[PDB]
Amino acid sequence: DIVNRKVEHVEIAAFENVDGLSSSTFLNDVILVHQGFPGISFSEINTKTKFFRKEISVPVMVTGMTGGRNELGRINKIIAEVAEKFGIPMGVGSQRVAIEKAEARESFAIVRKVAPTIPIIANLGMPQLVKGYGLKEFQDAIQMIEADAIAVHLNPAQEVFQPEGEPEYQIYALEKLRDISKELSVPIIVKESGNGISMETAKLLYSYGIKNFDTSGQGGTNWIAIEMIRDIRRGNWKAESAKNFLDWGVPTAASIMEVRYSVPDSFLVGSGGIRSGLDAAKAIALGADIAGMALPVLKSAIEGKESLEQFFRKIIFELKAAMMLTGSKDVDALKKTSIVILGKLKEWAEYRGINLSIYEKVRK
Amino acid sequence: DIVNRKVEHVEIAAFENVDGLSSSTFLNDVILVHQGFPGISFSEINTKTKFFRKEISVPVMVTGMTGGRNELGRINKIIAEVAEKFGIPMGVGSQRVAIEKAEARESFAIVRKVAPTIPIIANLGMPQLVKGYGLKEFQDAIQMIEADAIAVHLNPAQEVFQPEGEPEYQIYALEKLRDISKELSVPIIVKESGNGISMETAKLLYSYGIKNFDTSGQGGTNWIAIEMIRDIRRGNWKAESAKNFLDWGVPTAASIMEVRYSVPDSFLVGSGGIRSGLDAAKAIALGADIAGMALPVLKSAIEGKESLEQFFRKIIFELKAAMMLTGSKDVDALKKTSIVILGKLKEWAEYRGINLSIYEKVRK
Amino acid sequence: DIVNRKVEHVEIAAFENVDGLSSSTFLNDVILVHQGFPGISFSEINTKTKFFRKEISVPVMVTGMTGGRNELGRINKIIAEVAEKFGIPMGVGSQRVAIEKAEARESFAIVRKVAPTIPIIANLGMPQLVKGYGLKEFQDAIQMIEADAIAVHLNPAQEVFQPEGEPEYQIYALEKLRDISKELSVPIIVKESGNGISMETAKLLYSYGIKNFDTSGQGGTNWIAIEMIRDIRRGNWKAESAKNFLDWGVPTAASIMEVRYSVPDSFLVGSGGIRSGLDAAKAIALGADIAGMALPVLKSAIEGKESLEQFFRKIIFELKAAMMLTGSKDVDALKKTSIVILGKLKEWAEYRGINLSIYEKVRK
Amino acid sequence: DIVNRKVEHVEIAAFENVDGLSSSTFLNDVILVHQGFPGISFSEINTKTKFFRKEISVPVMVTGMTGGRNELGRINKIIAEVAEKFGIPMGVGSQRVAIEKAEARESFAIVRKVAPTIPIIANLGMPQLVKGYGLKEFQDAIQMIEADAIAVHLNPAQEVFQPEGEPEYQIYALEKLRDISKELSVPIIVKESGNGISMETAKLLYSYGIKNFDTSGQGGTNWIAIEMIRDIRRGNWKAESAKNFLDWGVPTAASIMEVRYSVPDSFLVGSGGIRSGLDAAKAIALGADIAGMALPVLKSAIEGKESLEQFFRKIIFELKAAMMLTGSKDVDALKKTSIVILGKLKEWAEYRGINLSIYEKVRK
Ligand SMILES: Cc1cc2nc3c(=O)[nH]c(=O)nc-3n(C[C@H](O)[C@H](O)[C@H](O)COP(=O)(O)O)c2cc1C
Ligand SMILES: Cc1cc2nc3c(=O)[nH]c(=O)nc-3n(C[C@H](O)[C@H](O)[C@H](O)COP(=O)(O)O)c2cc1C
Ligand SMILES: Cc1cc2nc3c(=O)[nH]c(=O)nc-3n(C[C@H](O)[C@H](O)[C@H](O)COP(=O)(O)O)c2cc1C
Ligand SMILES: Cc1cc2nc3c(=O)[nH]c(=O)nc-3n(C[C@H](O)[C@H](O)[C@H](O)COP(=O)(O)O)c2cc1C
Ligand SMILES: CC(C)CCOP(=O)(O)OP(=O)(O)O
Ligand SMILES: CC(C)CCOP(=O)(O)OP(=O)(O)O
Ligand SMILES: CC(C)CCOP(=O)(O)OP(=O)(O)O
Ligand SMILES: CC(C)CCOP(=O)(O)OP(=O)(O)O
Ligand SMILES: [Mg+2]
Ligand SMILES: [Mg+2]
Ligand SMILES: [Mg+2]
Ligand SMILES: [Mg+2]
């Protein structure tokens, strides 16, 4: 039944109209300044970067999506085996379903069988931490895929509108997380899920020892829309209310600025509606260390292995194009390349007290 | 004939295109910052608040609308009995028609028969104060429904365009109001009716001892539009002139900022185009103490009791969703949650000398 | 043939699509703050104001349009006799045609026969001043209609695109104007003709003794569009070039600000796209002493006397509505009522060094 | 085969939808202030200006386009003979094709046979400097047309997406350029090709001794779009990636401000989407010394000699119209005429640290 929600999520995300529905990343408000004389050759561009203790080929990761059933495991297999080939890290979806059901385990474990070298990121939800999960469940999630890190997701907006949702975000959960992190052999990443991380949330998490963030801002997969659709489907009246919240959240670009600014030493994944290598380049230039993608990887993987390989080729070419055209020889150079911030994003930053001058210093 | 206007008002408001016609609340310019870690559970959210000497369940009121005839009284009865059930305060429509016609009284009195505990708010127009109404008429309006307060409405824009309108707003009326307030057993609220309260008007009313305001800004029911339609109907040439004023007024959001800023200790209802619990949450976060609704309550009540009950359930769920997602455990926390002000509202505030820093301190 | 241009002008302005074509007044960027308690009664509003040595009923004038042929004279007659009835001043069109042709004189003179008391404003073009017109021509224009003032029009944009146009605006013309003003028994108003007066032009004219200005900004009658159409008609290739300049000029609202700011003691007509009494009210609140109108008076006059009477009633009602709703008892109060400046007009003012604070002081 | 790309470029530029495709010049954000009293006569307007050691009739140049084959040479012939007649300078297209193929030479040389007096500008691409071109190749390009200057183009964005592209922009190329300039008898202009010059690129080039720039910003011919179309045509998957970059680059207007500000003594060509004499006037008022045009000259030349003559008449009239209407008697006066900067251009400048006050001083 949790396994049912799992297939339904994939089905709605993949096949319904939920990508950027009534929402925005604000990334149109970010412009990378063109350099007519780049000072480099396309072929000397170096996209390698660090991901904790490993080196990755490209400053992009696939963020967590699925698992919990055979056909979900075969999607995970395709994603893992292509991510392995391209040298890019992969998060799996929530492993709750596999803590609850032993039959669901193989759909996660397959990932490490087929991807022995890339970083693999485990996944559990924050509500489970308030509902009995602790050290041993985290260790199980980690060992199940020989994870290099664990992502703990924030999805209170999704939980609020989800028919069987669990909107339990008591502070006790952070106390528990902080304790768990003491004993864990791998780092914790705290990621949102379509609604973004603000400076108040980032500072709170940091105060409990969290140093690794994944923005997952509005403007990509709309998880309120997905649950709205699940509510429409089962005649649940929360559907009409969900519609009022479709543009709820911190836009990806605003979230990147907010996290980088409020916690300048954070290791930061910029994700939520990254759809091209240009999006990826903007997210990095703005302040992220790596760009995250989920939905377009799902849709490609469903079409097949070769389709997903072509997808990654395209993303990597686009990223390098944006590095070439900004004179950025490597990832560090891109992080400090010249940008323009305009429009609503500029107004957002101004109101939120993000001094642009100190901002520019911090992102460089 | 006044009773005729009363039915015509309800009919045009309920069934014609007058809601936000060529007007705007500016509430799109207000964004509540999403908190990925709320620090609370949905079920611990407390929406109780004070309304003068009573406690109400939810920081929302139904503002005054109707009365004056049987079928208008049956609408009032539906509204009152549902408002009683939900623990929310209800204003009635103008009681002038019931001061003028004894047959109209029951259509107001029914309200207190069916709603013994909730705050009930009386209603008289400012133009009547200029035209001979005094203490006794106020006392009659109050006792008629055992009111906990009286609303005195400002509708000069409506009166200007109304075929039988009375645009008499001499300053003498305020001297009279101040005198009446000395002797009244319940507080006075001064409310607008679709065109909003500016700082000049708020400060003027305050200088005369008015401490309780209801913004009723532009962006919701368009009363100039209603009278334009009444003019079109009777071939009155004022109709074409009304069309030029459809976007006349202070937008609800700007009016909330203006009243809170210029009279920081005011008890403030934010109303005019509040259509969801998210609107309600924005209005409160901006500076209102409670959100007011009229038109969508009318339209639901016309459909029936159960329809109105479902409407309030939806509003309350949406409000609590916005409280959850900003980490607001109670109404006081919502009043000081993090916001972003963008666009035309920001430009409005800047021109009007609303220092945003002192504004943030004042709204808390 | 000049008489032909006169007929063609009226015909294109009245019946073709040239009103606000690809242009804007910026008046949407000006908002009059609504006062829910005006402090006045509609019937005590006083709209009287000064126009040089005469009193006028309403702070509105009909600006110069036509004359030069019988049917143009009958239009002038209708305008004059209604303007006389309403106590509002009337400018006539360019009297060049009547200096050049004795048969054209009656079409101007009729105006004073039918309107003995209102201010009547003569009209000559600046290019005529560079081409031989002097004191006597001015005196003839004045005595022809017993004028209370003379308007000298600036139309370089129109002259550039006009098939038989005369774009001669040598500085010598100003020396001449200054000399002529020494000897003239009535004041000179310098007016534009759809393209507006900037601060550089206003200060220049002031340095030569001009104190009376009529903005005639872009956003109403588009004179470049009129000449474009005349060019299209006669296969003149200047038509395609005119199209590139359709949005050329200082917007009416910007021009009012610019003239009031740069020449604070000016007597100022705000005109160019004034289409309602609300437009008129905004223009005066912004800084004008009176609002000017041409095109909509033309279109009404063509329909007839009664049609023009209804038009003025509508304008006057709308003005008084805007005065009522801002608590403006008289024209002086309107000149200092509260406004909001937003959008492009705000950006225009900022770039042009119009300090908003000193601006508010100067207009009040 | 390079000859083939040459024909294909002309064909796609002339006949496909690539002019301002998903791009913008930002020139709508620049407004020349209208002067109702110009202080001059149309006929006294002087448009003559300096182009290195020659005088040209009009502050406009045809920037480099084509050559390399007979039919391309006949286009160059038409352009050269009309440019000669109008006294305006002409750049030729890349002469690489003529260094590589002796048969291609006549298609460039024809230009000087038919245009003996106007400035003629040679052309070579920056990638060729990293690939073996040096002094002698420059001298050959120059002598081939008795050039008065050489343009070295920057096209890294084009090279990235070009099927046979050469995205080699190593810094060594500037070292070489600086050396070559020591020994060359004519000055070097560095020009972009539809994606614009930033302050970082301008300052870099300046640090290597480059004093003459041609902005070629986005908003006109979209070279990424041209290569996208060439990619679509040959089934190259880079096509989908090109689509993501269609709005990549510095908008012409922004580039003019950036180069003028960062290198205040530069000799500056403002080009990229200059389509009218009004565009030309804005570019000069903004900070350019001359306006450049390519695409609309190509399209006219393809129609014929008389068509191109009419095109230049139209451009010249529009320029003089804009000078008339700003009171600009000559090109120096236009360079310091009053402007307003609004919108995205204003935001661009602000973020990039272009102080508008020091900007106004520098451009005047
Ligand atoms: C079908 C699907 C399932 C997902 N499930 C999870 C989950 O189990 N755990 C998690 O942390 N994020 C999950 N996500 C959220 C993504 O990891 C990501 O944060 C979000 O979708 C925004 O990125 P995108 O716009 O590139 O999809 C899911 C995404 C998709 C499309
Ligand atoms: C049919 C109807 C009649 C109304 N009559 C009154 C009135 O008698 N007195 C009053 O103060 N306001 C009256 N109102 C104005 C409302 O109380 C409220 O201020 C305004 O409609 C804006 O709120 P809304 O957009 O939620 O309707 C009326 C509203 C409606 C829809
Ligand atoms: C048909 C017509 C002819 C006009 N001719 C004259 C003219 O002779 N002299 C003059 O000063 N302005 C003349 N005007 C310009 C107007 O006085 C006015 O400045 C301009 O039309 C802007 O006002 P509007 O938008 O209300 O028309 C003419 C206007 C119209 C509609
Ligand atoms: C068909 C065509 C070919 C071009 N080839 C050249 C080239 O060989 N060298 C060069 O420097 N620029 C070349 N350009 C770029 C233009 O000179 C100019 O910088 C750019 O097109 C922007 O101006 P526009 O928008 O007026 O076309 C070419 C332009 C066109 C339309
Ligand atoms: C986006 C995302 C977190 C989707 C998973 O949400 P979920 O609440 O269904 O996950 P759980 O299985 O952990 O409850
Ligand atoms: C919005 C609102 C005040 C509608 C009632 O206006 P009205 O002038 O019809 O009310 P009265 O019966 O008090 O005159
Ligand atoms: C708007 C306006 C001045 C129209 C009259 O322009 P015109 O050049 O036709 O007038 P003249 O008869 O004075 O030349
Ligand atoms: C715009 C422009 C420079 C077009 C010419 O680019 P190209 O790379 O084809 O020129 P080359 O022949 O110099 O390579
Ligand atoms: Mg969950
Ligand atoms: Mg009334
Ligand atoms: Mg003329
Ligand atoms: Mg090349």
In DSSP terms, D188 is beta-bridged to D150
CA D14 to chain CA centroid, nearest Å: 17
DSSP sequence for B252-273: HHHHHHHHHHHSTT-EEEEESS
B112: phi then psi, degrees, rounded to nearest 5 = -75, -25
Q: Specify the amino acid at residue C30.
A: V
Resolved by: X-ray
CA-nearest residue to A42 within chain D is D167
In the block, which residue shows the tokens 């908002």?
C31
Bridge-based pairing of strands C90-91 and C120-125 is parallel
Closest atom of ligand 8 to D124 CA is: 13
- Chain C residue numbers touching B168 (CB-CB < 8 A): 41-42
Q: Is the CB of A220 under 6 A from ligand 5?
A: no
DSSP sequence for A86-107: HT--EE---SHHHHH-GGGTHH
**Phi/psi class of residue C287: alpha, beta or left (left: φ > 0; alpha: ψ in -120 to 50)?**
left
- CB atoms closer than 10 angstroms to residue A344: 18
Q: Where are the beta strands (DSSP E) in chain D?
A: 30-32, 49-51, 54-56, 60-62, 90-91, 120-125, 149-153, 188-191, 212-214, 267-271, 290-293, 339-341
The number of domains in chain A is 1
Q: Specify the amino acid at residue A364.
A: K
In the block, which residue shows the tokens 């003491």?
A182
Q: Rounded to 10 degrees, what is the CA torsion of D209, D214, D215, D217?
A: -140
- DSSP label of C321: H
Tokens for A192, please give them: 């949102």
- The environment of the single-atom ion ligand 9, i.e. residues with CB closer than 5 A, is A 125
- Interchain CB contact of D278 with C (< 8 Å): yes
Euclidean distance between CA atoms B133 and B129, whole angstroms: 5
Q: Is the CB of C197 under 6 A from ligand 3?
A: no
Euclidean distance between CA atoms B96 and B141, whole angstroms: 8
Q: Is the CB of A99 under 6 A from ligand 5?
A: no
Q: Which domain holds residue C112?
A: 1-364
Q: Are the beta carbons of A133 and A123 closer than 8 angstroms?
A: no
- CA distance, residue D274 to nearest chain C CA (Å): 12
CA B278 to chain CA centroid, nearest Å: 17
Residue C112: give its domain's CATH number: 3.20.20.70
Euclidean distance between CA atoms C135 and C139, whole angstroms: 6
- Interchain CB contact of B342 with C (< 8 Å): no
Which residue, among D76, B42, D332, has the nearest Cα to A157 in the 3D structure? B42
Chain B, window 217-276: residues with a beta carbon less than 8 angstroms from a chain A beta carbon = 276
DSSP sequence for D264-325: TT-EEEEESS--SHHHHHHHHHHT-SEEEE-HHHHHHHHH-HHHHHHHHHHHHHHHHHHHHT
Helix ranges restricted to H, chain C: 2-15, 70-86, 96-100, 106-114, 126-130, 135-143, 156-161, 172-183, 199-207, 223-233, 238-243, 252-262, 277-286, 295-303, 305-324, 331-334, 343-351, 356-363
Which residue, among D52, D83, D53, has the nearest Cα to D65 in the 3D structure? D83
CA A309 to chain CA centroid, nearest Å: 20
Q: How far is residue D115 from each of residues B119, D67, D88, D140, D147, measured CA to CA in Å?
A: 91, 16, 10, 19, 11
Ligand 1 pocket: which of A216, A222, A252 to mutate (most atoms <8 Å of CB)?
A216
Bridge-based pairing of strands A267-271 and A212-214 is parallel
To the nearest 10 degrees (0 to 180), the angle between helices B295-303 and B2-15 is: 90
Contacts of D15 (CB under 8 A, 6+ apart): none
Q: Rounded to 10 degrees, what is the CA torsion of A117, A119, A124, A130?
A: 120
Euclidean distance between CA atoms B212 and B189, whole angstroms: 5
Q: Are the beta carbons of D115 and D76 closer than 8 angstroms?
A: no
Contacts of A235 (CB under 8 A, 6+ apart): none
Deposited resolution, Å: 2.4
Which residue, among C74, C68, C135, has the nearest Cα to C100 in the 3D structure? C68
- DSSP-derived 3-state class of residue C289: coil
- D268-303 residues labelled b (16+ CB within 10 A) or e (exposed): bbbbbbbbbbbbbbbbbbbbbbbbbbbbbbbbbbbe
DSSP sequence for D174-204: HHHHHHHHHH-SS-EEEE-SSS---HHHHHH
User: From the list D310, D324, D339, which residue is nearest C167 (CB)?
Assistant: D324
Q: Is the CB of B220 under 6 A from ligand 2?
A: yes
Chain B, window 196-215: residues with a beta carbon less than 8 angstroms from a chain C beta carbon = 196-198, 200-201, 204-205
Going from the Cα of D131 to the center of ligand 1, the distance in angstroms, rounded, reads 47
Ligand 7 pocket: which of C4, C128, C155, C195 to mutate (most atoms <8 Å of CB)?
C155
Q: Is the dihedral of CA C306, C308, C312, C314 positive or negative?
A: positive
> Does A278 contact D192 at a Cβ distance shorter than 8 Å?
no
- DSSP label of D67: -
- Chain B residue numbers touching A237 (CB-CB < 8 A): 310, 313-314
Which residue, among C260, C255, C224, C219, has the nearest Cα to C348 in the 3D structure? C255
D308: phi then psi, degrees, rounded to nearest 5 = -70, -35
Tokens for C94, please give them: 């360019």
In DSSP terms, D268 is beta-bridged to D213
- Interchain CB contact of C40 with B (< 8 Å): yes
Tokens for A169, please give them: 């975000």
Contacts of D162 (CB under 8 A, 6+ apart): D227, D230
Q: Is the CB of A123 under 6 A from ligand 1?
A: yes
In angstroms, the first-to-last Cα distance of chain D is 47
> Does C39 contact B198 at a Cβ distance shorter than 8 Å?
no
Q: Is C65 annotated as a binding residue?
A: yes
Going from the Cα of D39 to the center of ligand 3, the distance in angstroms, rounded, reads 22
Q: Are the beta carbons of B58 and B88 closer than 8 angstroms?
A: yes
- DSSP label of C267: E
Q: Are the beta carbons of D273 and D279 closer than 8 angstroms?
A: yes
> Does C342 contact B348 at a Cβ distance shorter than 8 Å?
yes
Q: Are the beta carbons of C20 and C217 closer than 8 angstroms?
A: no
- DSSP-derived 3-state class of residue C61: strand
> Does C197 contact D325 at a Cβ distance shorter than 8 Å?
no
> Does A41 contact D169 at a Cβ distance shorter than 8 Å?
yes
- CA distance, residue A1 to nearest chain B CA (Å): 23
Going from the Cα of D94 to the center of ligand 8, the distance in angstroms, rounded, reads 6
User: From the list C170, C195, C348, which residue is nearest D36 (CB)?
Assistant: C195
Euclidean distance between CA atoms D16 and C108, whole angstroms: 57
- Chain D residue numbers touching C160 (CB-CB < 8 A): 42, 321, 324-325
**Which residue ranges of D are tagged as binding site for FMN?**
63-66, 94, 123, 191, 216, 221, 273-275, 294-295
Ligand 1, atom 3, lies closest to the CA of A65
- Interchain CB contact of A342 with B (< 8 Å): no
Bridge-based pairing of strands B60-62 and A149-153 is unpaired
∠ CA A346-A348-A353, nearest 5°, is 95
Chain C touches chain A, with at least 3 Cβ pairs below 8 Å, answer no
User: Which ligand has the nearest atom to the CA of B96?
Assistant: 6
Number of H helices, E strands in chain B: 18, 12
Q: How far is residue D284 from each of residues C361, D52, D113, D279, D334, measured CA to CA in Å?
A: 36, 17, 31, 9, 7
Q: How far is residue B55 from each of residues B91, B128, B270, B321, measured CA to CA in Å?
A: 16, 31, 18, 22
Euclidean distance between CA atoms B139 and C178, whole angstroms: 71
- Interchain CB contact of A326 with D (< 8 Å): no
Going from the Cα of C283 to the center of ligand 8, the distance in angstroms, rounded, reads 55
∠ CA B351-B357-B361, nearest 5°, is 125
DSSP sequence for B88-122: --EE----HHHHH-GGGTHHHHHHHHH-SSS-EEE
- Interchain CB contact of B361 with A (< 8 Å): no
CA C322 to chain CA centroid, nearest Å: 21
Contacts of C45 (CB under 8 A, 6+ apart): C320, C323, C324, C328, C329, C330
Euclidean distance between CA atoms D342 and C343, whole angstroms: 10
Q: Is the CB of B270 under 6 A from ligand 2?
A: no
In DSSP terms, B251 is beta-bridged to B218
Which residue, among C153, C164, C159, has the nearest Cα to C64 in the 3D structure? C153
Q: Is the CB of B193 under 6 A from ligand 2?
A: yes
User: From the list C325, C327, C338, which residue is nearest B160 (CB)?
Assistant: C325
Closest atom of ligand 3 to C292 CA is: 26
DSSP sequence for C186-241: S-EEEE-SSS---HHHHHHHHHTT--EEE---BTSB-HHHHHHHHHHHTT-THHHH
CA B338 to chain CA centroid, nearest Å: 25
∠ CA C194-C196-C197, nearest 5°, is 150
Which residue, among B250, B243, B256, B244, has the nearest Cα to B219 in the 3D structure? B250
Going from the Cα of A135 to the center of ligand 8, the distance in angstroms, rounded, reads 62
- CA distance, residue B108 to nearest chain C CA (Å): 26
Q: Is the CB of C251 under 6 A from ligand 3?
A: no
- DSSP-derived 3-state class of residue C42: helix
